[PDB]
Amino acid sequence: MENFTTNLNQLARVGGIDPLIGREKELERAIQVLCRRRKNNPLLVGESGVGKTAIAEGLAWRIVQGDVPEVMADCTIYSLDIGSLLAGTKYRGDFEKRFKALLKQLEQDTNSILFIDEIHTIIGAGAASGGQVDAANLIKPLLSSGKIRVIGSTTYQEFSNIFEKDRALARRFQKIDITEPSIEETVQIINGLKPKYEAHHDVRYTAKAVRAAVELAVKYINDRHLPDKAIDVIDEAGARARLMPVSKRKKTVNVADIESVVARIARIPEKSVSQSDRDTLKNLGDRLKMLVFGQDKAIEALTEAIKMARAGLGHEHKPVGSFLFAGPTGVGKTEVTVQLSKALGIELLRFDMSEYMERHTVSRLIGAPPGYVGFDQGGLLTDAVIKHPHAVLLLDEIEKAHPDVFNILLQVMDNGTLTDNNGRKADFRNVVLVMTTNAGVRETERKSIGLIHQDNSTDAMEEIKKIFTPEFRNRLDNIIWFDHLSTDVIHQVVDKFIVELQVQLDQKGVSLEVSQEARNWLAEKGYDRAMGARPMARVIQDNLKKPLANELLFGSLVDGGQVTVALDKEKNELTYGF
Amino acid sequence: AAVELAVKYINDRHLPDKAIDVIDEAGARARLMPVSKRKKTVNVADIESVVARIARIPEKSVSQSDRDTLKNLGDRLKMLVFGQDKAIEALTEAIKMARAGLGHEHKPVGSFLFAGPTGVGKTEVTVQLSKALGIELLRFDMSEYMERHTVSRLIGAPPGYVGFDQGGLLTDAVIKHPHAVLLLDEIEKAHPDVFNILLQVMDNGTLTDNNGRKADFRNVVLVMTTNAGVRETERKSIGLIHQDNSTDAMEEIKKIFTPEFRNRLDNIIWFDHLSTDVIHQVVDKFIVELQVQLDQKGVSLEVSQEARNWLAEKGYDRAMGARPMARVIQDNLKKPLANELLFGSLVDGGQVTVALDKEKNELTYGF
Amino acid sequence: REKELERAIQVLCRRRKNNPLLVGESGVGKTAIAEGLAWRIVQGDVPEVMADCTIYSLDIGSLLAGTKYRGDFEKRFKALLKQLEQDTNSILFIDEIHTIIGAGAASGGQVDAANLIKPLLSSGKIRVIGSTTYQEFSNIFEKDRALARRFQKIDITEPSIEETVQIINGLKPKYEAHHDVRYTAKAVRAAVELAVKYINDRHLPDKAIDVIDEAGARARLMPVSKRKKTVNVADIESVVARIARIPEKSVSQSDRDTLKNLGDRLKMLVFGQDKAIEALTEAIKMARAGLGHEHKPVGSFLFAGPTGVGKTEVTVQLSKALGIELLRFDMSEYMERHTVSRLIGAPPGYVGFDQGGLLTDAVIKHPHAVLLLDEIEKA
Ligand SMILES: Nc1ncnc2c1ncn2[C@@H]1O[C@H](COP(=O)(O)OP(=O)(O)OP(=O)(O)O)[C@@H](O)[C@H]1O
Ligand SMILES: Nc1ncnc2c1ncn2[C@@H]1O[C@H](COP(=O)(O)OP(=O)(O)OP(=O)(O)O)[C@@H](O)[C@H]1O
Ligand SMILES: Nc1ncnc2c1ncn2[C@@H]1O[C@H](COP(=O)(O)OP(=O)(O)OP(=O)(O)O)[C@@H](O)[C@H]1O
Ligand SMILES: Nc1ncnc2c1ncn2[C@@H]1O[C@H](COP(=O)(O)OP(=O)(O)OP(=O)(O)O)[C@@H](O)[C@H]1O
Ligand SMILES: Nc1ncnc2c1ncn2[C@@H]1O[C@H](COP(=O)(O)OP(=O)(O)O)[C@@H](O)[C@H]1O
Questions:
Q1: Which of A111, A577, B360, C298 lies 20 to 30 angstroms, CA to CA, from C355?
Q2: Alpha-carbon span A2 to A19, nearest angstrom
Q3: What's the family (chain B)?
Q4: Would you call B250 exposed, middle or buried from its count of C-beta atoms within 10 A (0-12, 13-18, 19+)?
Q5: What is the Cα–Cα distance from A125 to A140, expressed in whole angstroms?
């Protein structure tokens, strides 16, 4: 007792314990257990960081304050330091000697309570070249006789996995569940605790700041539990605003600072648009339309979803956007998404649904069940989302995956959460789910038989409905049906590819100019409505790169200069030179 | 009473210690009661309260505030889920029979299978029921359980395997919250082999995880939501007259769920589609939620009545239930609102009025 | 890393659980970030709150060395804890935070360095900086809820191109002193860009610097005839090629000749069907001339025609003439849908998982090769 436990009453007398607020029924039942005749040993079990240790030390704090029923008055709770207890037990019997001496001291006191934090650790305290003769059994007979009182604290998992193993020790304690408090209890706890943090960080918290901290930590941080994550938000806000007086920012911590802390912790695009975040969102449709020609309404839908997200009008809990892009090949379905990722400056999560042809490939997405060979790997999808919570999720050619795999995205779109094999949950509320497919293509490109050609516009939707279950479609933000590229779009695509080729050549230090009629001839040569834009890339490659490759590989353009490409009219041929 | 209740509701210790602990805690409680000198005998009510607090289960509460909570539960839910009253009625009656003590022997509070077209309040009624009771909500998306060997994920890996020390998720959750609402979403999309776990649970209210530990489901409401049988109900027959395909819905459900599984259910509540007035109420609900979102930004909003009617007429889709209304309201309101909140008039200001003209059926905006 | 360093400093000055956790992919610079915080403290490039603070890197080996005689490890650990508590101005840096969840005494196996430290961290008594990769974190560290709760998660993200360029600029003098070689700015930028484009198995601030160091080391092995030189873009290209398997600038050698006479060297082996040799040579030339695709295979060709016309022979001869391996797959063996699992592997939890995929592994082992799909109509 001299130097192995710390007097918690002494701490509360010197203010070393943060004050216990609320927890009325919990502490009342802890006292009730303490007042039993036999096995008066309460065990505080609960989630990690919900106030179990807080309750245990707040009992002694209340004793010092005297706001306790007049049966635990003058009782002194001591926190056991197992670490220092085991320090010098090098020789046989030292541990048992010191432990039993402390035990008989506690027996003689008849007023003290021994609080053992993380009591699940005492299932072994030294069997070094020996048997079960450690503290796990030394403490057993004293509890059953009701001579001493011990308070335990452990999480549900550690309890179930370690403490429940020894039924003899397990039955000597009274399990008490410390549940996570609700909103009002948490904000009141913060109200009672924040004087100390204001003192430590030399700041002031507004009431709205505290309420916002509570609500945001609730709806944005799903890693931890309320009474600790809220005060963590508070502490980090205090520290940040305390580091600001380098420019003499002696002021209160308003709501905006709380949102800064929450966004920097949860890695979310918060803190209201502002600065230029507004400029970037403003001309995003432009920066995309200059790289994706035609199919502008897809860019419109994407930008509207992103703005609604940043404007605070997003969904309560859903991905930023859940889009199904369907249309013929080579019309920019994946390109608009990749360019959106590059424009926003965030991560692109590309997944090739063609690799998920079989039903049993779901385990590749979410991980293998426990006990199996691939358990230690987790799942690819959820791991990627957890690593990059703010990103764009691209699922290429979802019609190629097994029709059953869609049921994962079902829950992902509906709730924005996905649980891997470890019970961990990925947060999809900050991702844009975009799925590309060629579903309605073959049905729209059909030939009517009869004297009257029919309207086949609805056939793309018919095919998509036949492929995707009604509940899967019912969770999509919108289905943007892409149309084929028109000839002016083809000219613009040819120009974009010319710019790409020019960049490639500038890398080699040579310049290229292509006459306008040459561009027109290339467009008229390569245009194929049924195949979109890839034939343009192919024809441009064949017509320009191959002659250019020969010219620069074999001397004529080695460290060359200007490439002179123009079109003649008699043969529709191109010119070349240095 | 101490003996009987410690037997029936404590299953972690052995009888000669269970009863002694019940009696000792009752004595300590009656000894702490006389802070106002109420040194009394231990009545049956005190023993019942002690065991209910030990078993973490609800006691007799026909007088407390939760009696009123149960009194107005059906209405406090009907204000959030419009139509489909029979589901709310069944849920409330099951919760009452459990709380009234006139419950099932050792079964869960209620075992209900919710089936019907998508986009209706099958899962939403469950979320709002968990909120209205203030009890934990355990959500399990059975779509993550397509393979038959994912049962190991539910109940844990057998001893002598890599995933043993983690334990099952379902049993661990129920251990953490013995009084909760258990939501199993899209169970027909899980592997049909998984249904046998639910067989065992529904019949006995108990479940043994990998550690031989038994989870107690007697105080957990079991609600499972499916979209099974919907294809037939909405499938058009060929002929001059269409048939009620509800018989086909029943046939499909029986195809998917073995006879004993259907026998271990409290009821199968067939959710209906949403009517037009129900659509109007849904529009009102979503507009209220949008108004809350805007007030978070400091923007008041007023939407006219005929604008509401026009939104409902534009978004009404019988096949998809209430979900299309979300998109309709989204595009028709949030888009101009997002523009005005980002690079427009509604930056730190509100008073946005939306009204419908009759020449173009368009919306008004602005300060 | 001023943003991340500022986040770390903000975390350290907190009242409770003021223990930042540097989480990031390997090679990103987590250990580098901690030791550079120490370095800037030495140079005073810190806010006054962290000034005059001493960071200690905790060694686990020497801490557990010889800790027989139950209590030796505990006594030693508590002695370290007491020295740090008395210092009141020290931060303990644990390079591998996921490795302190076990400290022997498997009998019982509970009183380890993890449970020994939780009271200190929860009380805000001591400041410790951790570091771990993402998978180690999520599979080893975060499993201990109470320990993960006492640490503040900081994501150390992969830097950008220009950030990498500046990092290499700042690190260059040490590599110069080590190799006695000098780097040109164009060479550094080329190293960064080529490492991004062609090296796929590492992350920027550890693979661009890898190219820099290896170029310096090889140019240090050039003065066997005393070829004293600075590192130009050419050496960088050679280095990045030794991993990408195709040099871009070495084409100024006889590689130009091999390209030029390739069509003929094939025509002497494949008679007729000149169109195929022409197409293949044009594709390979466009690739080697830098005009090829930046994210596509060198060439994707479908050869169709009657039997015995040289469809398979021309590809084998092309592989021979180029000196590259022939990754040969017969699509008649993949006549069934489920056979794709041979090419890509089985999902986790299934019998063939640990084997991997045939095609992907063959490609990874041979980054530069010709892929032949015999009888594709049979798959
Ligand atoms: N009633 C309370 N009053 C004030 N703070 C509380 C209360 N309950 C919890 N806390 C906060 O939680 C922290 C203490 O956590 P607690 O001891 O409850 O969990 P724990 O013992 O750390 O759990 P584990 O052993 O799983 O880590 C304190 O920093 C405090 O801010
Ligand atoms: N609107 C467009 N503007 C510019 N380039 C385009 C456009 N549409 C297609 N492309 C070209 O096509 C390539 C990408 O095509 P994309 O991935 O969009 O096809 P897709 O719609 O996915 O068809 P599939 O799924 O069948 O491949 C780009 O390299 C780009 O040059
Ligand atoms: N009765 C209702 N009242 C109000 N809103 C409803 C109702 N039914 C559904 N909704 C809307 O639908 C959303 C919830 O959908 P839910 O999860 O119930 O779909 P579901 O029944 O699972 O369909 P599926 O299983 O086919 O996906 C809520 O956001 C809510 O706005
Ligand atoms: N901020 C930085 N400035 C310069 N170089 C850095 C920086 N961060 C990392 N590096 C480079 O990375 C190397 C050190 O690796 P670092 O400590 O960053 O990660 P690590 O210790 O390898 O991580 P782990 O411990 O997980 O393996 C150094 O050689 C250095 O060149
Ligand atoms: N055009 C050709 N020139 C020279 N040899 C050829 C030609 N076509 C076929 N052969 C010979 O016939 C054999 C079969 O050629 P291959 O291309 O593999 O046939 P397939 O097209 O059926 O795969 C080869 O070994 C090759 O030597």
A1: C298
A2: 25
A3: Belongs to the ClpA/ClpB family.
A4: middle
A5: 14
